[PDB]
Design a protein around this nucleic acid. Structure first.
Lengths: 181, 97, 31, 119
RNA sequence: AUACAGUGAAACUGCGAAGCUCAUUAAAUCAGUUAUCGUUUAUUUGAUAGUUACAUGGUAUAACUGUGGUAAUUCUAGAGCUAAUACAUGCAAUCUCGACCCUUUGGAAGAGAUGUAUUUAUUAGGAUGAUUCAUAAUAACUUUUCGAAUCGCAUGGCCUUGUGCUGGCGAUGGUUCAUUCAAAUUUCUGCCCUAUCAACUUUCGAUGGUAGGAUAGUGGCCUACCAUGGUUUCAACGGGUAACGGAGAGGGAGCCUGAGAAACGGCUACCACAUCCAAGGAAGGCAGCAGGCAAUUACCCAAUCCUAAUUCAGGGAGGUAGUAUAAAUAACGAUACAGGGCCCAUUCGGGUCUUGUAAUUGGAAUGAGUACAAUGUAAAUACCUUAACGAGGAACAAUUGGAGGGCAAGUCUGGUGCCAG
């Protein structure tokens, strides 16, 4: 047949899953950000490790190198577009200062809770998974969607959603129908 | 209210018709049928229904918009003479063999 | 400087008339 | 092949010419299940549409050629794009210096070539 | 339609029929390139033939009618028909030298000349760098070729009213040349280790010459004579290899068609296999294919292309369909009733405050399902989109593993009552 394909994993199991500090670390990260499992924490730790390893490798290179300059500035430009790094930390050492909590804060479910659209992180997740949240014009039901700044302000309730201006849901109209009958 | 937008209107004399891109805006509704779009297109172009062909309509993701491509033949006889047999069968101009 | 050398390198990698433009003109005339 | 992604964004900031940004919601591939569409893959799709408009007919993807053009292109996404900007070009190793270097035959080789350049 | 005239079974003609499975091979495969003035070439394209006829025959039969044999086949004999783009036959012009220089474009006495194809001999000789090349002529030769006895549509111009003369657009045929589609030889170049592979070749041609046979053709390709040559330590010859990095259609032999094949076609003789039968004979290439150590099927020529008496017909070429990843299992309030909840500490105990319900209750949201449609598409499945219904045990009832309990008019065992296991 024809050529095979390259695909890879988005996460890696920790070196030791069983030290207690780790366990309660996933406990509070999950509880505060309202995740489903530790799989997402291993995911996010995986990319944070990749980013910090690249940043460290770029630090090892001497100042003004084509390599260090080009790729370091590209790390930081993209890390500021994602909103993780602020405009005033336009430096790679501050990339090395990063933590998982910032990425998790960039997850859409955090914003849906956070802006006031939802009153609990689990309620925010329910609203997202239930076709009530629109980033701009487009409906997202993935809590793991990470938000940009321009995308951060454009989080609203869906035109099709009952709370955003559409007709009442099945339950409301059913109750109204039985009340009329 | 459906709105039908026709762009890149290229008059093809050799096949004796006009070819174009049809963009259909249908807010708050599923989509517009090809008989339905043919009715509108022939109304717009002052041509018979048998002389109008429409196909390849893909709804843009998120809904509310579709894009397909359409033909308006100069005559119904020319439409029968040049159109594919299967498209003629779709519109009823030809019987399935 | 490094950016310019890349552009100059790119321009090196990359009577006057375009075959597509002639086609587009027939397409436009038909239009 | 010569193009190195990280270099051309510097052109973008230094071009001083606008960039034709798309809508916030129009970029997400599929309800968010596929992350925000990267800049490059938006450049590939418009080739299809700019290709599709002229041909007058869509292009179907062969069942074979299908099997090496979506997954890895949406798994490089899941490996490498987190929010429509790629984190993958860096774990990769490339000699960008050749792309920066004035390797062409028109290169400073003797003292007189560079002196003529300085003129 | 008084020859027939639309359509049209059968038959005769014309065109075309050109995936698999085994083995394995170092520049002998293959890739690039050069030459064919050494060559064949269906088809495409363009040119190219003045040398009984108001239309000859069965020297002809199929299909078809009718009579029979056979166990029997794409097995058969007798008798009787009828056609061709099948088979054989075949038919009062033009140009020159031009007196008279008659008229001075011009007429004109007379003299003359006049296919193609094969082979041989001879004579002359625009093209290329180069030719015995192209071409022309002469004398003959040939199982001497070809030089429309063919078909559709229309019925025009003339007159000498006779259906008299003269005619428009096509198809199918035909000689030669060129062109194109190819093919066959063919120049030079092209990354493994190698001498623990040093001679190899003449080993029923090895190197070359002359003549012949074969061949589209050159050529030891083959044959008769003649000379002993040809490669090689600059690696000949031989060996190994991740050199998947060319062969057959039961096995060998011979033959037939076609422009193109030594044909996945057919024929003959053998060598074996094997089927049927009335045991008198007939026929097969399955000695296959696909599987297991088990559903490969159903729908199409539309999309890109391919072959034909061709737009239209077909193609198991081809296409269509069949059979590790992100979510949900819930979110939000109100009320009632209770005083305990928990951490740390081998040890004793110490530290700390809104906690528990195995209580009641209210209104919202939506996904799986139940599904009306359109779209989609050769059609169809699918995808996208989209009416109605759809949750409190939300029974619309995910699992897996581990750690502790406690209970009897219950059972067993051991002991120092009422214990211990």
């Amino acid at each position: 047949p024809r050529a095979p394909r390259t695909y890879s994993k988005t996460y890696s199991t920790p070196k030791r899953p069983y030290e207690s500090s780790r366990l309660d670390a996933e406990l509070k990260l999950a509880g505060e950000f309202g995740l489903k499992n530790k799989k997402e924490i291993y995911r996010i730790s995986f990319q944070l490790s990749k980013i910090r390893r690249a940043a460290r490798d770029l630090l090892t290179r001497d100042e003004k190198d084509p390599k260090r300059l080009f790729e370091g500035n590209a790390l930081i430009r993209r890390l500021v577009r994602v909103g993780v790094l602020s405009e005033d930390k336009k430096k790679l050492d501050y990339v090395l200062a990063l933590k998982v909590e910032d990425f998790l804060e960039r997850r859409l479910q955090t914003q849906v809770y956070k802006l006031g659209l939802a009153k609990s992180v689990h309620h925010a997740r329910v609203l997202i998974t239930q076709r009530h949240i629109a980033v701009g014009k487009q409906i997202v039901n993935i809590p793991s969607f990470m938000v940009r700044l321009d995308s951060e302000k454009h989080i609203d309730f869906a035109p099709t959603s009952p709370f955003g201006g559409a007709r009442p849901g099945r339950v409301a109209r059913r109750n109204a129908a039985r009340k009329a009958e | 209210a459906v709105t039908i937008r026709t762009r890149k209107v290229i008059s093809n004399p050799l096949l004796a018709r006009k070819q174009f891109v049809v963009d259909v805006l249908h807010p708050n509704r599923a989509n517009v049928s090809k008989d339905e779009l043919r009715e509108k297109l022939a109304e717009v172009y002052k041509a018979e229904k048998d002389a109008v062909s429409v196909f390849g309509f893909r709804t843009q993701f998120g809904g509310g918009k579709s894009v397909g491509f359409g033909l308006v033949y100069n005559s119904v006889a020319e439409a029968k003479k040049f159109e594919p047999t299967y498209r003629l069968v779709r519109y009823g101009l030809a019987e399935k063999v | 400087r490094l950016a310019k050398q890349y552009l100059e390198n790119l321009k090196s990698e990359a009577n006057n008339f375009d075959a597509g433009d002639l086609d587009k003109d027939i397409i436009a005339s038909r239009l | 092949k010569s193009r190195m992604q990280a270099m051309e964004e510097y052109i973008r900031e230094s071009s001083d010419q606008p960039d034709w940004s798309a809508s916030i919601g129009a970029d997400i591939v599929n309800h968010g299940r596929g992350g925000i569409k990267s800049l490059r893959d938006t450049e590939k799709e418009r080739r299809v549409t700019s290709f599709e408009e002229d041909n007058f007919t869509r292009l179907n993807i062969t069942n074979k050629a299908e099997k090496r053009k979506q997954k890895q292109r949406e798994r490089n996404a899941r490996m490498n794009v987190i929010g429509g900007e790629d984190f993958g070009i860096f774990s990769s190793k490339r000699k960008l210096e050749d792309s920066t270097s004035r390797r062409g035959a028109k290169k400073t080789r003797s003292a007189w070539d560079r002196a003529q350049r300085r003129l």
